[PDB]
Amino acid sequence: KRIPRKTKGKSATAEPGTSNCEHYKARPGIASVQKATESAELPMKNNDEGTPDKRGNTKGALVNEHVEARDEADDATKKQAKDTEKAKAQVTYSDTGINNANELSRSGNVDNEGGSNQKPMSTRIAEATSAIVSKHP
Amino acid sequence: VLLQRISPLQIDPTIISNTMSTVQTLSPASSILGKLRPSNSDFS
């Protein structure tokens, strides 16, 4: 047969003993627990900040680690307010009594080398190799 | 949510509501009634 991809490539009579009559209904509710299981199936997403592309530049938002961690806590609290919809979140990820000043997320601010990433790595490499180019007379 | 759909246990505030009381003289049953807030039904 032929199976397509999902990603991108490189380039007598009836013997008795049955009758559809269906007298029993599901006591916990088969559709309800069905949709709950379908919501629970989902694999988690990844973060990708601090990981390079093909070229070498780390993709991600140009933001400090700790303030991105608190931003992500606030946004997960916002999605918590979405689910079981209210005006405010019941369970919360911000506004905890635990001091968490020493938390670091992943960002695009820090490269894989250990320096900063305000200037991209491909630009740095092209500039370093363009520093020494010699020409004709 | 999955454990909500599985679990046989269901939760009502009516046990508190009929157990406590019926109703500026701060009654302790009324105080814990307003503190527990049984009109809310949210158990995430």
TrEMBL record, chain B:
Transmembrane segments: none annotated. It is found in: Virion. Inner capsid protein that self-assembles to form an icosahedral capsid with a T=2 symmetry, which consists of 120 copies of VP2, with channels at each of its five-fold vertices. This capsid constitutes the innermost concentric layer of the viral mature particle. This is Lambda-1 protein. It comes from Mammalian orthoreovirus 3. The gene is L3.
